[PDB]
Design a binder for this molecule. Structure first.
Ligand SMILES: CC(C)=CCC/C(C)=C/CC/C(C)=C\CO[C@H](COP(=O)(O)O)C(=O)O
Ligand SMILES: CC(C)=CCC/C(C)=C/CC/C(C)=C\CO[C@H](COP(=O)(O)O)C(=O)O
Ligand SMILES: [Mg+2]
Lengths: 253, 253
């Protein structure tokens, strides 16, 4: 029996590594040869992990098993997957990934995305992957900020109110009582407010990891979120262009 | 495939059946011959289901498989199991049961009893039992009232505070958002307040089942709780004596 939903190597690394930026490679958009090039640079920069994530995906297993293997051959850093679940299957998984981030979308109006996806995933476990070879699971409270009809239509999310702390405080109480490992604050079309990142940092337990992402395109923004209490600041889109090496150097500067 | 965590036949019955008392047989205390006699009387009284439940258990499978079978042979009422989980094993289960009530102890200071027991149980599914023979799972918010060091020591529960409605309002937001099937309000040493039963009834969705139990020993108490909004009023101890037939007649009428 490997850790599974219990803390393991990846969560320990995220809890103990220096806070900093984390690049997120969308494997369904970025060709694998480019992911491999990027992976070598991420290794040199000392990021905590390499996240592979996308809102959309198809033929997950055939694409991702070798995509994860190619990335892992290019970096010693843990490779962590982050994708939404789908009713009838649960969260997608491939052997070789070091961990899966499992988002409980507490702001969703659909109880499957709030948490029943977790039940479907674990029911199906271990499935086709040998027990001992399964990735670790990082149980995460996932929250969305700002108008976002795309995530709303797919996962039932409603933007978290920042008009007061009423809603956010309910999510903090759940995050603590339920022993979630991480909280992920994301904005597809806007920016998670730094003041909200601070409120979460103040309200979470010392060992709960705080990730913030969405429209981060500069090193200044990374610093501001880290100064606000984020443990990690994710960014994908800034590097989905030809001049990614320059952008990556600036963001990591 | 089995409904498992999705609504099935037992939850449909509990949602639609006329509200009323439900006798709970402790299978580790009550001899199977007595449970079968009782089962025949519960059938004559039109109760919604037969619950088999205990705070304590050992050698669960070898004891319960035949016990459940003997009870199922004596009544057409669904047989529902309700027992606490144990780390390393999850909730106990045997084939033949129509359903397992899965208590998420939202007031526990131990996240395993708050809900990780669910993850361990589903990971272990299907285990030693064919998928098609598995019981249905009734996802339940379980709350404790009054001083109760026994449950506190075993499961980490803290009595719900009714000095304001803040704590129960948080549990109601979870029960609704998470799509729990039922709420179980229990008092080991006192009585759940009828006012609390009312507060839960008014705050739950119409399809969420509300069970109340603990020290119910009279028909008057059953009536008071039904009038307050409980869908079902559970009682075990009142029948754990020689003159149980008189006690049952009083409680049911
Ligand atoms: C809604 C939620 C938090 C979880 C459900 C699972 C889910 C939809 C996972 C996909 C990953 C995600 C949250 C957003 C996609 O891109 C951003 C980077 O944004 P940028 O290109 O602006 O840097 C990222 O990967 O973080
Ligand atoms: C703490 C909790 C709600 C769930 C965790 C699992 C758990 C401890 C399950 C066992 C069943 C239980 C909650 C209490 C035992 O007896 C009462 C009836 O009492 P009375 O003899 O006074 O009628 C009952 O079975 O309801
Ligand atoms: Mg399983």
């Amino acid at each position: 029996a490997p850790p599974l939903w219990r803390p393991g190597r990846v969560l320990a690394r995220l809890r103990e590594h220096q806070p900093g930026p984390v690049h997120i490679i969308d494997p369904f958009k970025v060709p694998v040869t480019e992911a491999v090039e990027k992976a070598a640079e991420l290794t040199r920069l000392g990021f905590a992990a390499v996240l592979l994530a996308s809102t959309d995906y198809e033929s997950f297993e055939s694409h991702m098993e070798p995509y994860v293997a190619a990335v892992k051959a290019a970096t010693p850093l843990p490779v962590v997957l982050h994708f939404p679940p789908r009713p009838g299957a649960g969260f997608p998984v491939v052997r070789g990934a070091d961990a899966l981030l499992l988002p409980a979308l507490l702001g969703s109006g659909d109880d499957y995305f709030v948490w029943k996806s977790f039940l479907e995933t674990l029911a199906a476990f271990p499935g086709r992957i040998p027990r001992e070879e399964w990735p670790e699971l990082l149980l995460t409270v996932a929250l969305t900020f700002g108008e976002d009809p795309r995530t709303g239509d797919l996962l039932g999310t409603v933007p978290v109110s920042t008009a007061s702390t009423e809603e956010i405080d309910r999510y903090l109480h759940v995050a603590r009582a339920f022993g979630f490992h991480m909280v992920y604050l994301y904005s597809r079309n806007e920016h998670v407010p730094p003041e909200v990142v601070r409120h979460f940092r103040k309200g979470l337990g010392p060992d709960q990891v705080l990730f913030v992402s969405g429209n981060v395109r500069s090193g200044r923004q990374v610093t501001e979120y880290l100064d606000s209490g984020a443990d990690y600041v994710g960014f994908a889109g800034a590097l989905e262009q030809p001049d990614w090496r320059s952008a990556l150097a600036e963001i990591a500067g």
